[PDB]
Design a protein around this nucleic acid. Structure first.
Ligand SMILES: Nc1ncnc2c1ncn2[C@@H]1O[C@H](COP(=O)(O)OP(=O)(O)OP(=O)(O)O)[C@@H](O)[C@H]1O
Ligand SMILES: [Mg+2]
Lengths: 544, 152, 485
DNA sequence: TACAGATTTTATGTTTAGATCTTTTATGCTTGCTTTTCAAA
DNA sequence: TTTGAAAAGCAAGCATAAAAGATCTAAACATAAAATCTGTA
């Protein structure tokens, strides 16, 4: 049995797009193929600009690291908020070899391993460009005697917050011994993810005095000044300009979920925008109508479901208070210039007022509701240019058929679910999971996990297991269970066990114990012993 | 295949392979290569002293590790594999056969049948029964009986 | 290619890897290994330790006695000899494979009896009552690695040099598959069997499982320390295969040790020598000097050694030490250097026997300095008050300080307090430790008097006495100063 | 045959991941006693 | 407005889990000389 094994490879037999037919199965296959192609031409258009933004931020980070690095002590650079993913490339200084040595806390169990890995890397690089030596600091001593050139070592410490600071400290005083050699220049790069006050209290004061003689802070992250982010958001807006609308609830959900992630918020933003575009091109049959080519096959179902619109209902109520398909086509040529307004406001903030620290997503939020003035009042420099920079949000009929919105709770169920709470509400309720349609037992007897979770919830923090078994046993009908266990006459041992007078005390106990070990596997309960199984204590409370 | 002559317990599949072929020589380091070698074809391996195949200084799970890989391939469909694993009880699902330690009458029958080749029986019968009774009970060894008669 | 480390001192033997099972086409194609030149054994270093002597060295009367009592140069082993010879002769004659288990205490003549059995079997095979056999001797303590036995025995059988795994499979194939008419009987002595015990017991099981094979013709004589070595350190398979009939070598009685020593000194006791009085050289048949060693001295040495161990080495060494003591006194009184009745008396035997019985622990602690004695005395006071058997070093420091400051009217303490706390000097401050504190601490740790815990805090590190408390007190009771306080 | 190169075997050193046992310290149950708000008059 | 009374807090003591680490080993990683296998020649 391969299910009783660790890993097995199988090759399925074989005797094509995942998009389904909408409009309750009435949509044609050509609309499905068109919706597939339109989703891919928007998706590729967004992600190409994402690729160019990622390449640009990597290249600019390399450029500023090189500028800080090349402008009888260390040259120290603290990269604050660094996730240790940067490739630090070094120029080929003439008559001198520049060597990069990277160190991981897994590669740093002690000072000896740090030096041996560093010196092996140095000797490997020096032989790869230009008899063996001892992997030791005497190679730094005899580097000019063995290679002719002099040396410039750049140490990049990946993930300094996770390293043992005693080992790093002793490695720093060990590297300090190379200052008495005339041909040696040493630079250190510390990738700090918390702040500098955590690392100045873990090193010794002599180490701090050693590192103070030549050091540069550089706070480089994704939240630094909001530049990279706003570029991704503007790329997404330029992808959907003229075809799609962003709801204010969608933008505020983006702001709320991007507030809760600091180190990796950019690809989170890309992920939420990607799943929103996937949701729109999977749900809406009007997704083919974002270009004017596909307006030639609007059927009765399209006119039926575009008539259930609040904006259209408000518009026709206004017309009947004052006073179909061609009129619906007429609402496609309009511009909706809010994206151009947002990029014009961003350019006016950037290169007129020299304001860079603004969030374009929150600016788009305040433009979507209409509270741009309260957002622009904070800088105290747009007092006289606020009227020209303000424009009213226009209302367009049938906007909600072309709209990325968040009203159903889909985007907070697939990307940021209430996982523990979902398990708890599935276990406690259980009629919201299983359908209400053993024909008699399913209407009176609960599933064993759901029935056990009720007495789990209403008990105390430490539970005696036998009284918990008794409280499980009082919730079960013994006569209906014995009738259901006698339904199949083809099993002899079941029938000879059922007529035994303690059959229900066997059945309820073993269903109870399989539910107890299921609860132990999920992690709801634990045992307050190792050799005994007499008392449990619970670790999971609902609602937290 | 006796298992003390193995170097590593993980090499037994290779010892299974080299016991059958001449030809080509392919490296066997898991049971999968053995399974694909025996797949296009039956084969009986008799693993004596299989208690050596347990790994020392390894957690219960990893210690039993190789042996069930010896056994679960013996419970696979479309492979022609029969495993007969003889092991000593004192030192330590497949079908289990137990060899009970001999009693006095069985040892008497073994001794008389085994020196039935000799023309003249130099032992008295009650001496053989006394030696068999003294070499009996729990852990009844026929080697002990042979040593007792040789010492006599 | 840049190497992550180098092994520049590799010394690899020229030993081949192909075993014996793959050098012939089949079992029926193997030739007669008895009629082969390299099989069954069919010294180059002895010249290197010879020089020219240019002095006539003077050998006194006791020199022949001391050379006579050496272990290198069997009245009491006749039943063990008979049992081992009968078992080995019956196994050689019947082409059988067997195990002979022998165990005993050191020096009771196990190796000597096994070698005499083997020499008598070779003498019997020389005049053709038994088939010819090979003799292999493997000592477990003379192996660098335990698997070298595999490399040794096969090299004695085939003359080939292989690696240990290949040798093991070669021996397995030779013992199991080669027919008995095609091979020769091999008798292997396994000396110091406890040194061939590994964690997995591969070698023990292999050596005693080859004896259970039909075609093996292998006789294994296993020599060990104790009877219950298989029942303690071996599995039930090896204990079953070794067997139940195990041969005890009990210690010698005093009559047997006396007979061994008298059989050594048979030709030179109560004898006459020509001794030149100017130089002392003695020649067996200028003064005719009669040499004797008394039977009462030998008797009581045999009684003491037989009560202690039964070791023939110990009895021979006690007699040799008595002869050495007598020769030292003789060469002292006669002015004899190195180039009418001489008796090895009973007092020399009793001087030899008590020399390993006098204890230098009390003598060593009696002649220590005052500060080391003060350390030991303060440690004894701490063991008296708190009763811990392990005292902190800071407690010893404060107890030494307290013992100094309480007995401040004692004349010796008044004379020596400035020495302990200022080294007799102004411009040296009052010290927190006494002078030579770590010196006497390391001195008592070097002697094995103390045990010190491995801690880096000097105060709460504990120190334990490694010797008994009454000999320490006894040594403290000899001193005139520490008796008074 | 036959020799040069490639691969395997056997042997040893280097470093990491993890198990097992021992010792000292935290924690939880038990029993007794005292404080303090809570449903009822 | 009281009022007694049960929920809750404090403390000592002992059994026991658990952290910290001393000691050790298996396995991954690494090198390397002699034997052995191909592979043409
Ligand atoms: N029966 C004996 N007769 C004479 N000399 C003996 C006798 N037994 C022992 N010796 C002497 O004692 C020496 C030590 O004996 P032997 O080497 O046989 O000891 P052993 O019992 O094998 O001890 P160990 O366990 O230390 O190897 C011998 O070399 C010999 O000089
Ligand atoms: Mg010996």
């Amino acid at each position: 049995a391969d299910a009783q094994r660790s890993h097995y490879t199988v090759y399925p037999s074989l005797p094509h797009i995942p998009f389904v037919k909408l409009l309750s199965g009435k949509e044609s296959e050509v609309n499905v193929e068109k919706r597939w192609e339109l989703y891919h031409q928007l998706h590729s258009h967004f992600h190409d600009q994402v690729d160019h933004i990622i390449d640009n931020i990597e290249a600019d980070l390399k450029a500023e690291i090189s500028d800080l690095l090349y402008s009888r002590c260390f040259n120290t650079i603290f990269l604050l908020g660094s996730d240790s993913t940067t490739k630090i490339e070094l120029k080929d200084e003439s008559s001198r070899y520049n060597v990069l040595i990277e160190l991981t806390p897994k590669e740093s169990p002690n000072v000896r391993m740090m030096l041996r890995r560093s010196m092996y890397k140095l000797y490997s690089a020096a032989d790869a460009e230009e008899n063996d030596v001892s992997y030791d600091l005497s190679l730094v001593e005899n580097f000019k005697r063995l290679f002719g050139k002099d040396l410039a070592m750049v140490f990049n410490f990946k993930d300094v917050d996770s390293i043992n600071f005693n080992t790093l400290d002793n490695f720093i005083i060990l590297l300090k011994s190379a200052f008495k050699y005339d041909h040696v220049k040493i630079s250190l790069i510390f990738n700090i993810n918390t702040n500098l006050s955590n690392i100045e209290k873990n090193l010794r004061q002599s180490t701090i005095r050693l590192l103070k003689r030549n050091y540069h802070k550089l706070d480089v992250s994704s939240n630094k000044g909001f530049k990279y982010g706003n570029q991704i958001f503007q790329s997404f807006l330029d992808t959907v300009d003229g075809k799609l609308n962003l709801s204010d609830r969608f933008v505020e959900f983006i702001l709320s979920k991007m507030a809760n992630n600091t180190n990796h918020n950019l690809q989170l933003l890309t992920k939420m925008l990607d799943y929103s575009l996937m949701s729109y091109f999977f749900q809406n049959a009007f997704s083919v109508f974002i270009d004017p080519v596909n307006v030639d096959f609007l059927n009765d179902d399209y006119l039926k479901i575009l008539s259930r619109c609040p904006t259209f209902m408000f518009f026709v109520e206004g017309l009947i208070k004052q006073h179909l398909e061609e009129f619906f086509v007429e609402f496609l040529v309009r511009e909706n210039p809010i994206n151009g307004h947002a990029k014009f406001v961003a350019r006016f903030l950037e290169e007129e007022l020299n304001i860079t620290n603004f969030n374009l997503i929150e600016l788009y939020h305040n433009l979507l509701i209409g509270k741009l003035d309260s957002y622009l009042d904070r800088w105290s420099a747009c007092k006289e240019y606020k009227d020209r920079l303000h424009f009213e949000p226009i209302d367009t009929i049938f906007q909600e058929l072309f709209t990325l919105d968040n009203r159903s709770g889909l985007l907070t169920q697939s990307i940021f679910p209430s996982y523990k709470s979902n398990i708890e509400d599935n276990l406690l309720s259980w009629e919201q999971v299983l359908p209400s349609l053993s024909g008699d037992l399913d209407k009176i007897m609960a599933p064993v996990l759901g029935q056990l979770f009720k007495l789990y919830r209403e008990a105390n923090m430490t539970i005696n297991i036998y009284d918990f078994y008794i409280a499980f046993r009082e919730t079960l009908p013994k006569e209906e269970i014995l009738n259901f266990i006698r339904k199949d006459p083809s099993n002899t041992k079941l029938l000879e066990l059922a007529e035994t007078p303690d059959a229900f005390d066997k059945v309820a106990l073993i269903l109870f114990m399989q539910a107890i070990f299921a609860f132990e596997n999920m992690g709801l309960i634990k045992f307050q012993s190792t050799k005994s199984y007499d008392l449990v204590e619970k670790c999971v409370w609902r609602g937290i | 295949i006796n298992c003390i002559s193995l170097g590593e317990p993980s090499s037994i599949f290779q010892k299974i392979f080299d016991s059958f072929q001449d030809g080509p020589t392919l490296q066997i380091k898991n049971m999968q290569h053995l399974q694909k070698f025996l797949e296009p074809y039956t084969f009986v391996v008799v693993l004596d002293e299989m208690d050596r195949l347990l790994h020392a200084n390894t957690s219960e799970t990893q210690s039993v590790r190789t042996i069930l890989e010896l056994f679960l391939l013996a419970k696979l469909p479309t492979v022609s594999f029969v495993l007969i694993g003889m092991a000593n009880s004192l030192d330590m699902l497949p079908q289990t056969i137990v060899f009970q330690p001999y009693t006095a009458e069985q040892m008497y029958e073994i001794v008389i049948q085994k020196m039935s080749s000799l023309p003249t029986i130099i032992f008295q019968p009650m001496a053989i029964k006394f030696a068999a009774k003294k070499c009996a009970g729990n852990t009844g060894d026929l080697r002990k009986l042979f040593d007792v008669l040789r010492g006599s | 290619v840049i190497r992550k480390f180098t092994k520049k001192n590799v010394a690899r033997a020229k030993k081949k890897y192909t075993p014996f099972s793959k050098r012939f086409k089949s079992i029926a194609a193997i030739p007669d290994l008895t009629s082969l030149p390299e099989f069954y054994g069919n010294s180059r270093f002895e010249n290197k330790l010879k020089t020219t002597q240019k002095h006539q060295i003077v050998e006194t009367i006791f020199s022949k006695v001391k050379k006579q009592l050496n272990s290198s140069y069997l009245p009491a082993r006749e039943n063990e000899f008979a049992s081992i010879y009968l078992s080995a002769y019956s196994a050689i004659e019947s082409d059988s494979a067997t195990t002979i288990y022998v165990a005993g205490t050191p020096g009771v003549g196990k190796t000597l009896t096994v070698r005499e059995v083997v020499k008598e079997l070779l003498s019997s095979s020389a005049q053709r009552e038994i088939p010819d056999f090979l003799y292999v001797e493997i000592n477990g303590l003379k192996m660098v690695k335990p698997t070298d036995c595999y490399e040794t025995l096969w090299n004695k059988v085939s003359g080939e040099r292989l690696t240990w795994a290949a040798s093991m499979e070669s021996l397995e194939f030779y013992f199991k598959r080669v027919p008995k008419n095609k091979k020769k009987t091999i008798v292997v002595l396994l000396d110091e069997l406890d040194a061939m015990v590994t964690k997995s017991q591969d070698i023990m099981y292999n050596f005693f499982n080859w004896t259970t094979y039909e075609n093996a013709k292998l006789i294994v004589i296993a020599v060990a320390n104790t009877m219950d070595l298989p029942e303690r350190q071996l599995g039930n398979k090896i204990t079953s295969r070794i067997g139940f009939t195990r041969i005890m070598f009990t210690g010698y009685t005093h009559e047997e040790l006396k007979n061994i020593i008298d059989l050594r000194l048979k030709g030179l006791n109560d004898s006459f020598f020509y001794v030149d009085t100017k130089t002392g050289n003695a020649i067996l048949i200028v003064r005719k000097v009669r040499l004797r060693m008394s039977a009462d001295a030998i008797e009581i040495a045999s009684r003491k050694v037989a009560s202690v161990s039964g070791d023939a080495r110990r009895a021979l060494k006690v007699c040799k030490r008595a002869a050495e003591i007598a020769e030292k006194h003789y060469m002292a009184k006669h002015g004899y250097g190195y180039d009418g009745v001489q008796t090895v008396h009973i007092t020399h035997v009793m001087k030899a026997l008590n020399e390993t019985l006098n204890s230098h622990v009390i003598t060593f602690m009696t002649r220590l300095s005052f500060t080391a004695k003060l350390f030991i005395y303060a440690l004894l006071n701490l063991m008296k008050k708190n009763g811990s058997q392990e005292q902190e070093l800071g407690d010893i420091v404060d107890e030494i300080k307290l013992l100094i400051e309480v007995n401040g009217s004692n004349k010796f303490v008044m004379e020596i307090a400035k020495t302990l706390f200022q080294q007799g000097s102004d411009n040296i401050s009052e010290q927190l430790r006494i002078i030579s504190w770590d010196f006497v601490l390391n001195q008592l740790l070097d002697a094995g008097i103390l045990f010190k815990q491995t801690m880096k805090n000097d105060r709460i590190c504990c120190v334990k006495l490694n010797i008994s408390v009454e000999e320490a007190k006894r040594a403290m009771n000899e001193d005139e100063t520490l008796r008074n306080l």
